[PDB]
Structure formats: structure tokens, C-alpha cells
Nucleic acid binder design. Sequence first.
RNA 1: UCCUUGUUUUGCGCAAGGUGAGAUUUUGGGCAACAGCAGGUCUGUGAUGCUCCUCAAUGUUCUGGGCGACACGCGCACUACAA
Length: 132
Amino acid sequence: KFTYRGLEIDPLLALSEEEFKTLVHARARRHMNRHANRRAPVLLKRLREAKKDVKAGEKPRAVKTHLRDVVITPEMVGSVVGIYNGRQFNAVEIKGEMIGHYLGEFSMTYKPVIHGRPGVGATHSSRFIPLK
RNA sequence: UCCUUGUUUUGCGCAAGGUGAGAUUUUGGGCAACAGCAGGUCUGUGAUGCUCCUCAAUGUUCUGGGCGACACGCGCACUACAA
């Protein structure tokens, strides 16, 4: 199951570029129009390569990229993509509900913070907090 | 300036009134001595002493990605919006 707009997988695939960018949100539309002229020259190819070659019963071989300014189309669904937070290629597989998004959104770029006791200088009043 | 010849010592001026566009540093600025601080700035400059680094660089990198005064229990400064 998954409904993007009340469309299963096969309808989405069937859509040509025109019919596609009509259906998607405002950002995605704006993106595609402004771009033209490739602008994901390698990031299409590398996926569709390793995608095809699979014997199924398991995911494609992972591909790595730094880029995250590229959309998620119904073409690239099922693949295993790397996305780069500035020190780690991060593992994501592409679901049918990741259509209408970007890549970068699934790849965290910071550790969430959880604190560890405040030291001196926090509290204005002075006690010279032992021991942390 | 003028007058009150008030006040003041005849002096330096002062108070009230008059004249007038304007009445007392007319109103508001800019400039500003002598002696200093071991204040700040080597992130302004082909302003720099001595040191550090130099081809797998601390250089150049307008290269790809992240981070920056932004990441979140909490204290403080200034701002804005309200009851």
C-alpha cells in the first residue's frame, strides 16, 4: 500500500514529465522548470544501472552521492541511495511515500543534543558547582 | 541695544518689562589643551619586527558536502507586540 494522490505505483510510472509535474507540489514544479539541461547527469544513471541488474529478492547495490538538491521521482523508487552529511554516507531506501520530497531531508546533519549537566557560568549566583 | 534711573560700588553684572522674525552661549551640531592607560585592533590595508607553516601545506581552492553570530532543560542584555 501507498497512495501519493490516490495513485498506486503503476499509474505514477505511466506518467510523462508533463503529467508528473502537474501532479506534484509547488516546490517540485518550480524546481523542474527552472532546471532543464540535465542537472542530475550521473545520479539518474548510477541508480538505474544497479537497479536493473538485480535478480530481486533483495535491494539493489548501494550508490553514494554528496548531492541532495535533487527531487525524488517515481523512477528512482526501490533504490538504495547514499546522502552525505559531511562525514558519513547515510543509508536510505526509497519508499513510495518519499515521492514529493528531496534526499537531504532523510539524512540528519547533526546529533540531536541531550545535554549533560550545566557547569559554572550558568546560574548567575555563585557556588562554584562541584564537580561538573 | 533701550528702559525701570529697580538692584549693583561709580565697577563686573543681575532681575522684571519693552522693542522685535528672534532675547540671552538665539537654537542644534562639528572642532577641542597638558599629562597619560602596559584600554581595543596583527579579522581594514603592498602598515609591520621576530617567529610558525610551506607541494600529501596552516598557501591557493570563488571545488562538492556540513558548520558559522542557528544546533537545546537553564541564567542574563537589548528589541518588538499585548493584556
